[PDB]
A = this chain, B = another copy of it.
């Protein structure tokens, strides 16, 4: 306990706050989704509710330490409020995202962070035909709201969404689920913005 107390004191109390990524010092956030459930569908408003967790990985030099100097500590769990986190935002959401898990990140000696918030999202999705064989396809872009590609780039480990925790007695079955890097442009800003497009094909069980 005593060695970790020193480490956290040395990293946070002394040091000034990391101001976020820049053009000169850009960052790459790795994103991956695990789908737990499609909970609800609203055919009158075209809203659909997903329950999932979103694995986020990035790396900062300012969070580095030498394990010999702090009793062989290679990593620690700390509150997400203590560190900077990327502003990863669903682009077609219809409600504020509901937080389902503790906001605690794992920081490792090399400066790499792992942060996995569990979320419930309501987003825009036409569910007409969900009760047929073909099913329906819906998409939602996840990316930084304010940082362009020149400050925050994104990537995935795999293009396949993790469905090994998907609820087996859900009212919907997943036919496919993919997560793909995209480049988009918007009216505000001349520079490109990056997102991870979550494309989920699904239908009712029988």
Chain A residues in the interface with B (C-beta under 8 A): 1, 4-5, 8-9, 16-20, 22, 24-25, 34, 36-37, 39-40, 44-47, 51, 55, 62, 71, 73, 76-78, 87, 89, 92-96, 98-102, 104-106, 114, 116, 118, 120, 124-126, 145-147, 151, 162, 164-165, 167, 169-171, 186-188
Residues of B within 8 A of A187 (CB): 34, 55, 162, 164
Residues of B within 8 A of A162 (CB): 187
Question: Which residue of the partner chain, among B73, B89, B98, B170, contacts A96 with CB atoms under 8 Å?
Answer: B98
| Interface class of chain A by DSSP | loop
Residues of B within 8 A of A37 (CB): 92, 94, 124
Residues of B within 8 A of A44 (CB): 40, 171
Q: Which residue of B lies closest to A115 (CB)?
A: B146
Most chain B CB atoms below 10 A, which of A17, A34, A87? A87
A5 to chain B, nearest CB (A): 5
Question: Which residue of the partner chain, among B4, B76, B116, B147, contacts A188 with CB atoms under 8 Å?
Answer: B116
A-B contact pairs, 16 of them (CB 8 A): A5-B17, A19-B76, A20-B78, A37-B94, A44-B171, A46-B170, A89-B101, A89-B118, A95-B120, A96-B98, A102-B145, A102-B146, A104-B146, A116-B188, A164-B187, A165-B186
